[PDB]
């Protein structure tokens, strides 16, 4: 830990996008099993918790779905670029850095996957609505905030 807010391990939250105004979901379904859904749904499949990385993954976090138990991944170049997988963080592309925003994004943060060099995206208009982007090129649709029960 540092001064950066990190939810306690295991605490549930939803992840609201700055640009999209929607929350990520993860469900046990055939493809697609992840996406965005509306905040006022208040659905269990919009909840996640963090698994704290340890050893070489200290200071990174896996994002575990409450509804499925799988963790999110973010990758390039293999498609789909984002999704979920079992294993509580068994793969390198399951580990994220919480990177706080500056100026008008101080309540928000990016979710950057450092080894593949990608950042999660939550957007309107252009599909896929939940996706990623190379993390060197920053737009405000890469920003998220936590919502709690």
CSV table of C-alpha atoms in Angstrom, one decimal:
chain,number,residue,atom,x,y,z
A,1,UNK,CA,0.0,0.0,0.0
A,2,UNK,CA,0.7,3.8,-0.6
A,3,UNK,CA,-1.7,6.8,-0.5
A,4,UNK,CA,-3.6,5.4,-3.5
A,5,UNK,CA,-7.1,4.1,-2.5
A,6,UNK,CA,-7.3,0.3,-3.0
A,7,UNK,CA,-10.5,-1.4,-1.9
A,8,UNK,CA,-9.9,-3.9,0.8
A,9,UNK,CA,-9.3,-7.4,-0.7
A,10,UNK,CA,-12.6,-9.2,-1.3
A,11,UNK,CA,-14.8,-6.1,-0.8
A,12,UNK,CA,-17.4,-5.9,-3.6
A,13,UNK,CA,-17.9,-3.0,-5.9
A,14,UNK,CA,-19.0,-2.0,-9.4
A,15,UNK,CA,-16.8,-0.2,-11.9
A,16,UNK,CA,-18.5,2.9,-13.4
A,17,UNK,CA,-17.1,4.4,-16.6
A,18,UNK,CA,-16.3,8.1,-16.7
A,19,UNK,CA,-17.4,8.3,-20.4
A,20,UNK,CA,-19.9,5.5,-20.7
A,21,UNK,CA,-21.8,6.1,-17.5
A,22,UNK,CA,-22.3,2.3,-17.4
A,23,UNK,CA,-20.8,-0.5,-15.3
A,24,UNK,CA,-18.9,-3.5,-16.3
A,25,UNK,CA,-20.7,-6.9,-16.1
A,26,UNK,CA,-19.4,-10.5,-16.1
A,27,UNK,CA,-21.8,-13.4,-16.4
A,28,UNK,CA,-21.8,-17.2,-17.0
A,29,UNK,CA,-23.1,-17.2,-20.6
A,30,UNK,CA,-21.9,-18.1,-24.0
A,31,UNK,CA,-20.0,-15.4,-25.8
A,32,UNK,CA,-20.1,-12.5,-25.1
A,33,UNK,CA,-19.9,-13.0,-21.3
A,34,UNK,CA,-18.6,-9.5,-20.5
A,35,UNK,CA,-19.8,-6.0,-21.5
A,36,UNK,CA,-21.4,-2.9,-20.0
A,37,UNK,CA,-24.8,-2.6,-18.4
A,38,UNK,CA,-26.8,0.1,-16.9
A,39,UNK,CA,-26.2,1.4,-13.4
A,40,UNK,CA,-29.8,1.3,-12.3
A,41,UNK,CA,-29.9,-2.4,-12.9
A,42,UNK,CA,-28.1,-3.0,-9.7
A,43,UNK,CA,-27.3,-6.6,-10.7
A,44,UNK,CA,-25.1,-9.1,-9.0
A,45,UNK,CA,-23.2,-9.6,-12.3
A,46,UNK,CA,-22.0,-6.0,-12.1
A,47,UNK,CA,-20.0,-6.7,-8.9
A,48,UNK,CA,-16.3,-7.4,-8.6
A,49,UNK,CA,-13.7,-7.7,-5.9
A,50,UNK,CA,-9.9,-7.4,-6.0
A,51,UNK,CA,-7.5,-10.2,-5.5
A,52,UNK,CA,-4.2,-8.7,-4.2
A,53,UNK,CA,-1.1,-9.6,-6.1
A,54,UNK,CA,1.8,-10.8,-4.1
A,55,UNK,CA,5.6,-11.2,-4.7
A,56,UNK,CA,6.3,-10.0,-8.3
A,57,UNK,CA,2.7,-9.0,-8.6
A,58,UNK,CA,2.7,-6.8,-5.4
A,59,UNK,CA,1.0,-3.6,-6.3
A,60,UNK,CA,-1.1,-5.1,-9.0
A,61,UNK,CA,-4.6,-6.6,-8.6
A,62,UNK,CA,-6.8,-9.2,-10.3
A,63,UNK,CA,-10.5,-8.2,-10.8
A,64,UNK,CA,-12.7,-11.1,-9.8
A,65,UNK,CA,-16.4,-11.4,-10.9
A,66,UNK,CA,-18.8,-11.9,-8.0
A,67,UNK,CA,-21.3,-13.7,-10.3
A,68,UNK,CA,-18.8,-16.1,-12.0
A,69,UNK,CA,-15.7,-16.2,-9.8
A,70,UNK,CA,-13.5,-15.7,-13.0
A,71,UNK,CA,-11.0,-12.8,-13.3
A,72,UNK,CA,-10.9,-10.2,-16.0
A,73,UNK,CA,-8.1,-10.2,-18.6
A,74,UNK,CA,-6.9,-7.5,-21.1
A,75,UNK,CA,-4.6,-8.4,-24.0
A,76,UNK,CA,-3.4,-7.6,-27.5
A,77,UNK,CA,-3.1,-8.8,-30.1
A,78,UNK,CA,-5.4,-11.9,-29.5
A,79,UNK,CA,-9.1,-11.3,-29.8
A,80,UNK,CA,-11.4,-10.6,-28.0
A,81,UNK,CA,-9.1,-8.1,-26.2
A,82,UNK,CA,-11.0,-8.3,-23.0
A,83,UNK,CA,-12.9,-11.1,-21.2
A,84,UNK,CA,-12.8,-13.3,-18.1
A,85,UNK,CA,-11.0,-16.6,-17.3
A,86,UNK,CA,-10.9,-19.0,-14.3
A,87,UNK,CA,-7.8,-19.4,-12.1
A,88,UNK,CA,-7.7,-16.4,-9.6
A,89,UNK,CA,-4.9,-14.6,-11.6
A,90,UNK,CA,-3.0,-17.6,-13.1
A,91,UNK,CA,-2.1,-15.6,-16.3
A,92,UNK,CA,0.1,-12.6,-16.8
A,93,UNK,CA,-2.7,-10.5,-18.5
A,94,UNK,CA,-5.0,-10.9,-15.4
A,95,UNK,CA,-3.0,-8.3,-13.3
A,96,UNK,CA,-3.9,-4.6,-13.2
A,97,UNK,CA,-2.5,-1.3,-11.9
A,98,UNK,CA,-5.0,1.2,-10.5
A,99,UNK,CA,-3.7,4.5,-11.9
A,100,UNK,CA,-5.4,7.6,-10.4
A,101,UNK,CA,-6.6,10.4,-12.6
A,102,UNK,CA,-5.4,14.1,-12.4
A,103,UNK,CA,-7.4,17.4,-12.7
A,104,UNK,CA,-11.1,16.6,-13.3
A,105,UNK,CA,-10.5,12.8,-13.0
A,106,UNK,CA,-9.3,12.8,-9.4
A,107,UNK,CA,-12.3,10.6,-8.4
A,108,UNK,CA,-11.4,8.2,-11.2
A,109,UNK,CA,-8.6,5.9,-12.3
A,110,UNK,CA,-7.3,3.8,-15.2
A,111,UNK,CA,-7.1,0.0,-15.0
A,112,UNK,CA,-3.8,-0.6,-16.8
A,113,UNK,CA,-2.6,-4.2,-17.6
A,114,UNK,CA,1.1,-3.5,-17.7
A,115,UNK,CA,2.7,-6.5,-19.3
A,116,UNK,CA,0.5,-6.3,-22.4
A,117,UNK,CA,0.6,-2.4,-22.3
A,118,UNK,CA,-3.2,-2.0,-22.4
A,119,UNK,CA,-5.9,-0.1,-20.5
A,120,UNK,CA,-9.5,-1.0,-20.1
A,121,UNK,CA,-12.1,1.2,-22.1
A,122,UNK,CA,-15.7,1.8,-21.3
A,123,UNK,CA,-17.4,3.9,-24.0
A,124,UNK,CA,-20.6,4.7,-26.0
A,125,UNK,CA,-21.0,4.9,-29.8
A,126,UNK,CA,-18.0,2.8,-30.8
A,127,UNK,CA,-18.2,-1.0,-30.2
A,128,UNK,CA,-17.1,-3.1,-28.5
A,129,UNK,CA,-18.3,-0.9,-25.7
A,130,UNK,CA,-16.1,-2.6,-23.1
A,131,UNK,CA,-12.7,-3.1,-24.7
A,132,UNK,CA,-9.1,-1.9,-24.3
A,133,UNK,CA,-6.6,0.5,-25.9
A,134,UNK,CA,-2.7,0.7,-25.9
A,135,UNK,CA,-2.1,2.4,-22.5
A,136,UNK,CA,0.5,4.9,-23.9
A,137,UNK,CA,-2.5,6.8,-25.7
A,138,UNK,CA,-4.7,8.1,-22.9
A,139,UNK,CA,-8.4,9.2,-23.4
A,140,UNK,CA,-10.9,9.8,-20.7
A,141,UNK,CA,-12.9,6.7,-21.7
A,142,UNK,CA,-10.2,4.7,-20.0
A,143,UNK,CA,-11.3,6.0,-16.5
A,144,UNK,CA,-13.4,4.3,-13.9
A,145,UNK,CA,-14.7,4.9,-10.4
A,146,UNK,CA,-15.8,2.5,-7.7
A,147,UNK,CA,-19.5,2.2,-6.7
A,148,UNK,CA,-20.4,0.3,-3.5
A,149,UNK,CA,-23.6,-1.5,-2.3
